[PDB]
Amino acid sequence: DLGKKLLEAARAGQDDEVRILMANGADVNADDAWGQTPLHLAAQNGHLEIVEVLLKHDADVNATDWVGMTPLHLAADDGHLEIVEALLKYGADVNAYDQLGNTPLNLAATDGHLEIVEVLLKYGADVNAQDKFGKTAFDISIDNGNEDLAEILQ
Amino acid sequence: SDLGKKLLEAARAGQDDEVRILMANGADVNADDAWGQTPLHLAAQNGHLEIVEVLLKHDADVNATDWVGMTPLHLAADDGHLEIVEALLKYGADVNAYDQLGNTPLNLAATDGHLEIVEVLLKYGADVNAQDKFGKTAFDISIDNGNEDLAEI
Amino acid sequence: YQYNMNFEKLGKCIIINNKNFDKVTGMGVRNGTDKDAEALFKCFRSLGFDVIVYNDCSCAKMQDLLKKASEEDHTNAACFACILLSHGEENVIYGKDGVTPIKDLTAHFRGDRCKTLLEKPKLFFIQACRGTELDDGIQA
Amino acid sequence: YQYNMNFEKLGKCIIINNKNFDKVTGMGVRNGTDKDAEALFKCFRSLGFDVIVYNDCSCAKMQDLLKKASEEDHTNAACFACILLSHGEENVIYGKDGVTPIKDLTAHFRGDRCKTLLEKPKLFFIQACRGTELDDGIQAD
Amino acid sequence: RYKIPVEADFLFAYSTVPGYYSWRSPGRGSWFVQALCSILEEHGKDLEIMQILTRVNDRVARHFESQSDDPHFHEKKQIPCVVSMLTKELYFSQ
Amino acid sequence: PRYKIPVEADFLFAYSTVPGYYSWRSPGRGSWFVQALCSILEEHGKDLEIMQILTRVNDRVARHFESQSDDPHFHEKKQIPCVVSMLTKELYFSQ
């Protein structure tokens, strides 16, 4: 119930409300029916300062939802550079596979997010990770004709 | 009229006694339903010979046409009611009536192989050259259905 | 929230009862369909419909009838109903001599083509196969 | 004569909001679809569904999500809902990378394939073109 | 001034879903028609068209199951299929 | 002991448009169908049966929307949604 308001405040990006709910003892690791946490919802909707307040308040950085996605999965997918960095600084599993065969590196490669790819590589992203179709980060970059990214992945 | 309606239903269902009673009571013999079918149409179609005859004796319009121009003879010829066909012809049914779909009694009868009906229709002057919507005469129809006896006549 | 029923007539209902099929089609007899047509004739008449039944229609005849039905004056009817009883395949129904697209039959009743039924319910009840798949069912 | 609603949860509702499409498909942006997805998120949440929204899904990602959604345990749910917002053609819907049959998506929820939704309503709301025909309309004169 | 979609105000009551067989008893008539008449006789003047066709769906689904000495055709099931482009509620109340 | 359920039973498909047709969407307001659906659900979602709702949706889409375009081909067009039900009971969203 306090958790529900926290989930919604995070999805919303209601910073002040999030801080109030934290102060009132809301469970930072509360999860909804799809197994998504406030960290999932903030990370996905680009709410950096909420992501950071959640992280500093011991949110499970590697919480997985109903299809095995972590907050890093969602952030990499949506192109949130600073959030990806924030997640990684708190020990996000850089090479985590969700139940759909996605890794953060491959998600970022797919959508052409160069800076994110570079940060993931810096944190030890596995360049040999196979998407369900047997495609790696590099393979995906060529098929999309993104040659600058292909260069980075070498 | 409620009585006109009861006569229509009595005639379709083959209620002989009910038909005579309604007539004696002044029911309109030429009562019409929403599709333009008369008691004569309904009796003729469903093989009710004695009802057809009682209606005929009470001056039913033998050549009444319904919503698609079909007469009681069309309906009788199609369904193979030989005796009904004759009763209708004896009361002056138009042997060569075209409905709005291009049907003639002869062509209807030829299609289903009703040999005796064809012969009666011929006797009453049916046009052997009449063409259906696809240009076929009674003869063309008899071949396509493999009816070798009908082809002979 | 309700279709206006304040009309002289509920409306017309035409039933196409196809039982026997030309040998060329390879289709068998539809036993039991006469009972269907008779039960439907009674139900629909009881509701208030003026019902008429046509047996064993070729494709051309079904087409002409539905077209002609759409050209009747429905000003004083609340709605219209058509019932088709025949063999069928996907999107099509059998006349006695072959198949015709169901959409061709219903097209005559579109708002721009059938003005006296505009804003009135046009009902089609269709008893026919729509392909060869069988539902094996499942137990709870 | 009524579906049993005496369950812990009304149920799950998954929304696929496809707005942006790969250059290879040649399909344009579906502006306004974000408002659709947000308004639907609110309405369906208000009814009692637990709602989730996935944006810009490939065909494979749509297939997998729906398959996965069918593999959830719906024992304590009254029903299930899916909302698809995308470009479309006859019998078919667009992922970001191409077209997929609508029937492939719903197939996972068939009675023999999804036991915990058996005898429960399975609802699919589909906002997509189904061909190129235009309704010119007609005036009531 | 107001136009009506030309495709508006139709309802299609199919005996079965697309791609499927539709079952008929040689002695009793088709499953769908049997169920439809049964419902209409009992409720035709009381219920809205969608309540009627829904009870028809239920009747066909629950109370019919094919019988055949051909294992391929034995113990099969059926569900009808209502397609509505109706814009109002329909009661047969005239 | 025996009753089977058809594997195709208990689905409902609420299509924004009829087979073969375009489905209209306002770039600023969203799709005609979704606009209408949310509007009806907000007002009646917890009171009416699912088919009552979708029928009002049909009516709302049919009467209150009409396309606008400088392209004569796309101007002043109409839409009707399309409900396909294999449901076997009445559905109220009630709890």
So where are chain C's domains? 1-140
Annotation marks residue D87 as catalytic: yes
- Report resolution (Å) to 1 decimal: 2.3
Task: Name residue D87's beta-bridge partners.
Answer: none
Question: What are the residues whose beta carbons fall under 8 Å from the beta carbon of F56, sequence distance 6 or more?
Answer: C1, F40, F44, F48
Greatest distance between any 2 Cα atoms in chain A: 50
For residue B13, the number of C-alpha atoms closer than 13 Å in the C-beta half-sphere is 13
Q: Which of B37, B51, B103, B61 is nearest to B81 (CA)?
A: B51
Task: Give the dihedral sign, CA C47/C50/C55/C58.
Answer: negative
- Which residues, at least 6 apart from D37, have a Cβ–Cβ distance to it below 8 Å? D15, D17, D53, D55, D85
From D43, D59, D108, D129, active-site residue: D129
Distance of CA B137 to the CA centre of its chain: 19
Identify the active-site residue in D43, D87, D108, D114.
D87
Q: Using CB atoms within 10 A of its CB, is residue E82 exposed (0-12), middle (13-18) or buried (19+)? A: buried
Taking phi over 0 as left and psi of -120 to 50 as alpha, with beta for the rest, A105 belongs to alpha
Catalytic status, residue C129: yes
Residues 108-137 in C contacting D (C-alpha not used; CB under 8 Å): 111-112, 115, 118-119, 136-137
CA–CA separation, E75 and B41 (whole Å): 44
Whether F37 and D127 have beta carbons less than 8 Å apart is answered as: no
Residue C82 near residue C13 (C-beta atoms within 8 A): yes
Contacts of F76 in chain D (CB under 8 A): 136-137
> Distance from CA of residue C140 to its chain's centroid?
35
Query: E34 phi and psi, to 5 degrees?
Result: -50, -50
Instruction: Select the residue from C75, C90, C112 to test the D interface by mutation, using most D Cβ atoms within 10 A.
Output: C112
- Is the CB of C50 inside 8 Å of chain B's CB atoms? yes
User: How far from chain centre, in Å, is Cα B56?
Assistant: 12
SS3 D9: strand
At residue C2, the 3 state secondary structure works out as strand
Beta bridge partners of C84: C16, C126
Evaluate whether C127 touches E18 at the Cβ level (below 8 Å).
Answer: no
CB pair distance less than 8 Å for F85 and E54: yes
How far is F63 from chain D, CA to nearest CA, in Å?
Answer: 11
| Helical residues (DSSP H) of chain C, grouped into ranges | 33-47, 59-70, 102-106
Say if strands D9-17 and D50-55 run parallel, antiparallel, or are unpaired: parallel
Distance CA C119, CA E4 (A): 8
Integer angstrom CA distances of residue E39 from B31, E49, F92: 32, 11, 22
Greatest distance between any 2 Cα atoms in chain E:
62
- Write the DSSP string, chain B: -HHHHHHHHHHHHT-HHHHHHHHHTT--TT---TTS--HHHHHHHTT-HHHHHHHHHTT--TT---TT---HHHHHHHHT-HHHHHHHHHTT--TT---TTS--HHHHHHHTT-HHHHHHHHHTT--TT---TTS--HHHHHHHTT-HHHHH-
Q: Up-side HSE of residue F54: CA atoms within 13 Å toward CB?
A: 26
Residue E29 near residue C36, CB atoms below 8 Å: yes
At D96, list the tokens: 């970001």
Q: Domains in chain B: how many in total?
A: 1
**Cα–Cα distance for residue pair A62/A54, rounded to 1 Å:** 13
Q: What is the CATH number of domain C1-140?
A: 3.40.50.1460
For domain E1-94, give its CATH number from 3.10.105.10, 3.30.70.1470, 1.10.220.110, 3.40.710.10. Answer: 3.30.70.1470
The secondary element (H helix, E strand) that includes residue D82 is strand D77-85
Domain segments of chain E: what residues? 1-94
| Contact between residue F83 and residue F51 where contact means Cβ atoms under 8 Å apart | yes
F5 → closest Cβ in D118, D123, D124? D118
Domain CATH number, residue A148: 1.25.40.20
Torsional sign, CA B102, B107, B112, B116: positive
SS3 A42: helix
* Distance between CA atoms of residues C16 and C84, nearest Å: 5
How many CB atoms within 10 Å of residue D67? 16
- The answer for residues whose C-beta is within 8 angstroms of residue B9's C-beta and 6 or more apart is B15
**Which pair of structure tokens corresponds to residue C118?**
């505009």
Cβ E4–F59 below 8 Å, yes or no? no
Question: What H or E segment, with its residue span, contains residue F32?
Answer: helix F32-44
Domain F1-95 class?
Answer: alpha beta
Solved using: X-ray
Which region holds residue B49: left if phi is over 0, alpha if psi is between -120 and 50, else beta?
A: alpha
Q: What is the DSSP letter of C31?
A: T
Q: Which of C110, C108, C88 is nearest to C100 (CA)?
A: C88
Of D12, D64, D72, Cβ closest to residue A100: D64
Which residue from D12, D64, D65 is facing A33, i.e. has the nearest CB?
A: D12
Interface membership of C1 toward E (CB under 8 Å): yes
Please state, in angstroms and rounded to a whole number, the distance separating the CA atoms of residues A75 and A85.
10
Partners of chain F (3+ Cβ pairs below 8 A): C, D, E
HSE of D52 in the Cβ direction (CA atoms, 13 Å)?
21
Domain range for A152: 1-154
**Shortest Cα distance from F8 to chain D (angstroms)?**
6
Query: Tokens for A56?
Result: 């500093």
Looking at beta carbons, which residues of chain C come within 8 Å of D118? 138, 140
Cα-Cα-Cα-Cα torsion A51, A55, A56, A58, nearest 10 degrees, comes to: 150
Helix, strand, coil percentages (3-state) for chain D, rounded to 5, are 30, 30, 40
Name the amino acid, one letter, at C68: K
Query: How many C-beta atoms lie closer than 10 Å to residue A107's C-beta?
Result: 26
Token representation of residue D48: 């009692």
Answer whether F84 sits within 8 Å of E87, measured CB to CB.
no
At C101, the amino acid letter reads P
Given CB atoms, is D73 within the 8 Å cutoff of chain C? no
Tokens of E36: 């439809």
Q: How far is A75 from chain D (nearest CA, A)?
A: 13
Determine which helix (DSSP H) or strand (DSSP E) holds D60, and give its type and residue range: helix D59-70
User: Which residue in the block uniquely carries the two structure tokens 């589909």?
Assistant: D126
Tokens 């006349």 label which residue?
C95
Q: Whole-angstrom distance between the N-terminal and C-terminal Cα of chain D?
A: 41
CATH classification code of D1-141: 3.40.50.1460
How far is CA D77 from each of CA A33, D42, D74, F53, rounded to the nearest angstrom?
Answer: 11, 19, 5, 21
- Burial status of residue A145 (CB atoms within 10 A of its CB: 0-12, 13-18, 19 or more): exposed
> Whole-angstrom Cα distance, residue C70 to residue C80?
9
**Hey, are the CB atoms on E24 and C32 less than 8 Å from each other?**
yes
